[PDB]
Design an enzyme around this catalytic site. Structure first.
Site, PDB file in Angstrom:
ATOM      1  N   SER A  28      15.936   2.707  -2.064  1.00 14.22           N
ATOM      2  CA  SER A  28      15.517   2.311  -3.431  1.00 14.22           C
ATOM      3  C   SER A  28      14.965   3.540  -4.155  1.00 14.22           C
ATOM      4  CB  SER A  28      14.469   1.218  -3.433  1.00 14.22           C
ATOM      5  OG  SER A  28      14.875   0.089  -2.706  1.00 14.22           O
ATOM      6  N   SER A 106      16.831   2.265   4.216  1.00 12.24           N
ATOM      7  CA  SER A 106      15.868   1.422   3.459  1.00 12.24           C
ATOM      8  C   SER A 106      16.660   0.283   2.834  1.00 12.24           C
ATOM      9  CB  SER A 106      15.058   2.277   2.508  1.00 12.24           C
ATOM     10  OG  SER A 106      13.870   1.616   2.214  1.00 12.24           O
ATOM     11  N   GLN A 107      16.582   0.060   1.514  1.00  8.64           N
ATOM     12  CA  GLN A 107      17.446  -1.000   0.947  1.00  8.64           C
ATOM     13  C   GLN A 107      18.920  -0.758   1.324  1.00  8.64           C
ATOM     14  OE1 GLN A 107      18.917  -3.034  -3.232  1.00  8.64           O
ATOM     15  NE2 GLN A 107      17.115  -1.711  -3.316  1.00  8.64           N
ATOM     16  N   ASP A 161       6.599   2.733  10.853  1.00  6.33           N
ATOM     17  CA  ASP A 161       7.370   2.310   9.668  1.00  6.33           C
ATOM     18  C   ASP A 161       7.360   0.785   9.568  1.00  6.33           C
ATOM     19  OD1 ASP A 161       8.891   1.929   7.520  1.00  6.33           O
ATOM     20  OD2 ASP A 161      10.618   3.100   8.237  1.00  6.33           O
ATOM     21  N   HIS A 174       8.142   6.077   6.899  1.00  8.21           N
ATOM     22  CA  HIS A 174       9.409   5.674   6.232  1.00  8.21           C
ATOM     23  C   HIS A 174      10.094   6.895   5.630  1.00  8.21           C
ATOM     24  CE1 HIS A 174      12.157   2.660   4.767  1.00  8.21           C
ATOM     25  NE2 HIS A 174      12.013   3.068   3.473  1.00  8.21           N
TER      26      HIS A 174
END
Ligand code: NA
Ligand code: NA
Length: 195
Positions: A28, A106-107, A161, A174
């Site tokens: 993101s 991530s996303q 994370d 992260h």
């Protein structure tokens, strides 16, 4: 600054298919279609095989890597997941004998997971290996990709994370996957593509 991008599956000749095709979804707010991790991962594959023998492809188009879309079903928008599926189907229709490898951060890891689940049994067989960094659906998918065999997957979830632990709390760990993108993840993908 312009985000790092590659579109070699979209631009490549169907008469000149490569040994391997990497399709990668960014995290993101990241810019371009590769973000921070996609470019080092594709560079590592190109260092191994040669730049002419890998097509590096980021997921763009309607995948805008929007912060709000982490809250949606499966962790990205339906249109972004469909874009992943369109590129996987393009890899299969243009270059059915090429090895595909997938990745996401991530996303983008959620997008990748969902698009691989949604792809055909034949497309999933073509995706010889997948790497997920900071997998936002690690807890909810119990460390896997639905419908995809575990031997073909590595999940990189740093110690601490919390996005890997059923939250969207983004902490320093992260942001720690640059070394896996450079090292473990391309090494794993290389083992599944072959030398
Ligand atoms: Na290339
Ligand atoms: Na790391």
């Amino acid at each position: 600054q312009v985000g790092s991008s590659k579109n070699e599956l979209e631009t490549g000749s169907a008469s000149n298919c490569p040994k391997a095709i990497l399709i990668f979804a960014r995290g993101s707010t990241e810019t371009g279609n590769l973000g921070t991790l996609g470019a080092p991962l594709g560079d590592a594959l190109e260092s191994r095989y040669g730049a002419s023998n890998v097509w590096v492809q980021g997921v763009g188009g309607p995948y805008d890597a929007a912060l709000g879309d982490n809250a949606l079903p499966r962790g990205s928008s339906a249109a972004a997941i469909r874009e992943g599926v369109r590129l996987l189907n393009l890899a299969n229709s243009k270059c059915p004998n090429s090895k595909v490898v997938a990745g996401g951060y991530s996303q983008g890891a959620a997008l990748a997971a969902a698009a691989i689940s949604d792809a055909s049994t034949t497309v999933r067989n073509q995706i010889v290996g997948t790497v997920l960094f900071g997998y936002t659906k690690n807890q909810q998918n119990r460390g896997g990709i639905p419908g995809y065999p575990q031997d073909r997957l590595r999940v990189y979830c740093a110690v601490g994370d919390l996005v890997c632990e059923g939250t969207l709390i983004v902490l320093a760990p992260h942001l720690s996957y640059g070394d896996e993108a450079r090292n473990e993840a391309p090494a794993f993908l290389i083992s599944k593509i072959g030398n």
